[model samples]
Target: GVVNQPIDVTVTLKLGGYEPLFTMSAQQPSIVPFTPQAYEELSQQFDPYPLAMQFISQYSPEDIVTAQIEGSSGALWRISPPSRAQMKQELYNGTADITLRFTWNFQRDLAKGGTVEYTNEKHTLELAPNSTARRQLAQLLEGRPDQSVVIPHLFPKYIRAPNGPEANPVKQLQPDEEEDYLGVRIQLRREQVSDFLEWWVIELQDCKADCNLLPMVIFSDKVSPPS
Candidate 1:
């Protein structure tokens, strides 16, 4: 008999060398009439959308950050980033008052369905000040020596499988299976705009998914960093 338990997955946004900024979790219901062939098709069709985070230097009252979570509908979800003022207050009062927003899609049948079937749902996460993340971020702001941004280590390079020269083997989940955690680390670079200004930007770094095998499934795209 085939078990039909739902799968639980988590996507965490982490700054290299520091604590995670946020975590998004989603659950997918098991497909009916589970079979090896059916599972294979489902796995092949599974894909996670691309996500982007940007730190904007307002250079005025406060600086703001924004995240773009590309949705299946082609609609972009722009979530407000924490401001320098909020971060400062968090440091003083030791409280987190930031929220993150995004949408998650669940995969369904594809073989008999002829087309891919999926469900999209929006979600939000609340951040607290005393959390390691808040404290760490505050340190980044206050620790700057020349008013320049700090560039952390890049996302670790993924290691390839030892077998043949093909890419890493894809891990498929079985019925009643659960994949708990998946972490996506973002590499930020220090960029100077003008004589007296600089910003923290996301650099196009090596694809961790290509070399290293992740606990869950995902897709990647080819792009170049700023010149």
Candidate 2:
């Protein structure tokens, strides 16, 4: 994944089987259908080791709706479902966002049913758009996963950049250099976990931290292609 200088985002989407993951401004937030990784980490954190636990094989969405995060004791949070379009955009263009921690009842071993305990009183996770993190994250989560996106990597094809110390725009890159607009087109793969990282952590870092640091840039300005 190559992002020469991205100013805006492309796409973002997440599907939750145990949907309805958050409550707005909750003291603690949590996500549903905890992947193996998420479940393990959270379960251990909430309950201590060598602790006697039991499993409940029968339960529905409301079984424990009013419960606390598996191992945490914080304010409950509310959440809204991210749109499917947002997910597709990430595949078409590129995207980024911030991720924060939430609170919810951690579902332990579904087969054997797990135990519950409280967490150290703290609830606020750091959520950000990171392809890499999402990759590492996906490794833990289990579901049919697929991703494809375009990340800009080439130098502005139409704009020539300054070469020497005294090079000026007029003497450097010129729009007249070519007839076609040389933007960018990247092919992303879900298998390429590294690319996901680039999209979320590295690329997102720039946009959120210091996008203003970039040069004054311009483009065709039309949202899509020309007719």
Candidate 3:
């Protein structure tokens, strides 16, 4: 197909069989279903070497729950779910806690010659209410898949940073920026092989610079013993 031509794919797996019958534009070559037999059939269609499948089959019950929490200043906090056993271990162990790795992809013109990159800002935290935090975390994990929640007391310590260079510095947003409110969002999910959890802190309000997301420096607020 020509570049930019949109193609919508629909895989209909019937109750009787998983054969995915497909038909598209006459100008395009015949598309085959993702199966061992399908590969052989494709070989027949293309004499020398049949094109391999474009997209690999994604198994149901995803293995990872990936979530993004974007700050008003364009900084993003990404949370990736760990394996099933590791997730359970965090809940059971008292030493375990939630860690949010904040990052800001600086997409702008800088006067400095050095290469700009995403800030690897790490924030480690234990759920609030020392007495019941562990218990609450346990319940949240075991409760359900795709369960999303907002925790009030669970917050991040201020990571005071000079937004960027004072001369045309990229705007970095803070919790105190107009006070839209900041908190964490926890999501429970499972992949094909294992279950996991992702945690993110929500951004408060929207702030921009010249129609672009202003980049900010993300610094880790909490101090920790080296791992």
Candidate 4:
């Protein structure tokens, strides 16, 4: 085998036992060569490891689907890694043909589903009647401003009034003599095994319409919450 020698390799992707979905042949620069010195150096660099290259191809089914692929949308192939001696022998003969074939299978069990559970947690912020929080809450309920602009990240799902159908652009609650309050419900979802955390307002509550604004700030999992 010669290092940096130009070699042609054929990569084929097929559907199960059917003919190839696609085939591609390209001249790839080779890192394997026949000389002992070159083999020794390569062997050291990849010490105790077999040299292997990965190939990936994406396909659009419009042309054939209109033909098909079964159960699984894709497939995987595992070929024995070639040894240094075998590579050297193939290179010396000049009849070296590295043909890689991938066979895809459709497994019915792969379509099975399992139950997913989510944990629920809540934090409430109390707004003063004359504070900025109260003013923004008023804006969210009374104005036609872009919800995103009025409150970044948080989207207005619906407005709840003390008695009536739920609506958007909810009417602002009049400040009652008693402790008047609006409750904002923020729902946070994070997979038990994942680092991603997502939160949103499921609904708003007005003296329990039963609902909720202020500029809601959502911090990522990597960032610390405000003190």
Most accurate candidate by TM-score? 3
Off by over 4 Å in 3: 1-83, 95-101, 109-124, 128-134, 153-181, 191-227
Ranking by TM-score: 3, 1, 2, 4
Top candidate by lDDT: 1
What is the TM-score (0 to 1) of candidate 3?
0.32
Model 2 misplaced stretches (Cα beyond 4 Å): 1-82, 87-96, 104-122, 135-227
lDDT of each: 0.29, 0.24, 0.27, 0.23
lDDT of 3 by residue, 1-227 (tens): 00111111111111011111111111112211124454344335434422212111211112111111222211221323354345445545646444322222212112222222122122223442233544454555564654444443222222221223211111132224323223444433333321332322232223234212111212211122222
TM-score on alpha carbons, each prediction? 0.31, 0.19, 0.32, 0.16
- Residue pairs with backbone overlap in model 1: 95-129, 96-128, 96-129, 158-212
> Model 1, stretches more than 4 Å misplaced?
1-82, 91-97, 102-119, 142-179, 194-227
Candidate 4 lDDT tens digits, 1-227: 10111122222333123233233333222212224453344336435432210000011111001001111112222222243223223323423232212311111111122111111122122232344433343333222334411212122211111111111221122123112323333222222331332222223332233232121111001111222
Q: CA shift at 154, candidate 4, in angstroms?
A: 9.5
Distance from true position, residue 67, model 1, in Å?
17
Check candidate 3 and list the clashing pairs: 61-191, 62-190, 62-191, 63-191
**What is the alpha-carbon lDDT for the whole of candidate 3?**
0.27
